[PDB]
Amino acid sequence: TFGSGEADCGLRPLFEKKSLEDKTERELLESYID
Amino acid sequence: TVEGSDAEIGMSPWQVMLFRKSPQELLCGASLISDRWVLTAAHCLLYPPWDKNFTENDLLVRIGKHSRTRYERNIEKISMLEKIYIHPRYNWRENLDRDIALMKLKKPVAFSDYIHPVCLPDRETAASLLQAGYKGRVTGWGNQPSVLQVVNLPIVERPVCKDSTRIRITDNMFCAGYKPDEGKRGDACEGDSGGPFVMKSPFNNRWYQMGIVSWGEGCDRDGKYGFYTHVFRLKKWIQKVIDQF
């Protein structure tokens, strides 16, 4: 089955994988807290 | 996009460019969901009134691109298409309901720093993240910059989406974008069609593809919002196509 997809899906090599934050992602996470 | 900002290198490594061969130009956005499966909008491939009926041999995909004006030596990858699957209930006659297609790559793409699949949401993730006021991110090309553009856009309440268009909005759709009084602060355009609307999970810090750009009523038109295919709602069909190959 495909299922939930790659074990690794949605974790970026140059960001999440290296604990680096992109320039605008904090705006997305802040919108969940409001 | 309009009023977007330049993507960082490797910021959207699931981004796919769907090209025509003749002329050799960008047709639509798309997204990488595995080493051999790419998601796009059905209307990018199939729209009978406009004699739009692309087949596998009409198109190619480019993957790992930051710049639309340079071949990115040792970064970008190219693939031919083995097979196109349009959603059988794709409704081009009325409202682009189920505006989704899957494309099977002739050869699987190697993952790299620049090429990596996005996650598709489960029921839990869609329930948590796909709510009015929460922002997701659209990636595309300026409608003038040469590099991939990023816009972050809030999800719009369902009644407000319906009131903003004459199109019949279904539960397989959602809309996003700033309100008119907000002013110019970024927009997804008709030109960003096919590309992903992604959201970063605060639970597992993975990126999920919640939407596909279906149509845009702003930018070059006097309307308000962008309209997206609701990927979670079509996920059984996606899994069925991939499993049954």
Numbering used by the authors:
A (entry chain L): 1H, 1G, 1F, 1E, 1D, 1C, 1B, 1A, ...
B (entry chain H): 16 to 36, 36A, 37 to 60, 60A, 60B, 60C, 60D, 60E, ...
Question: What did the publication describing this PDB structure actually write?
Answer:
Members of the trypsin family of proteases participate in key physiological processes ranging from blood coagulation to apoptosis. A common theme in the trypsin family is that proteases are synthesized as inactive zymogens and then converted to the active enzyme by cleavage at residue R159 that generates a new N-terminus, typically at residue I16.
As an alternative perturbation of the I16-D194 ionic interaction, the I16T mutant was also crystallized in the free form at a resolution of 1.7 Å and final Rfree = 0.20. The substituted polar side chain of T16 inserts into a hydrophobic cleft in a position similar to that of I16 in the wild-type and its N terminus establishes an ionic interaction with the side chain of D194. The position of residue D194 is slightly altered and breaks the H-bond with the backbone N atom of G142, which in turn shifts the 141–143 strand, breaks the N143–E192 H-bond and causes the 192–193 peptide bond to flip. The resulting perturbation destroys the architecture of the oxyanion hole, unlike what is observed in the structure of the D194A mutant. The new interaction pulls the entire 215–217 segment into the active site and seals access to the primary specificity pocket. Perturbation of the Na+ binding site is particularly evident in the I16T mutant, where the ion pair between R187 and D222 is completely disrupted and the two side chains point in opposite directions. Consistent with this structural observation, the Na+ binding affinity of the I16T mutant is 70-fold lower than that of wild type. The I16T mutant also features a significant drop in activity toward fibrinogen and PAR1, with kcat/Km values about 1000-fold lower than those of wild-type.
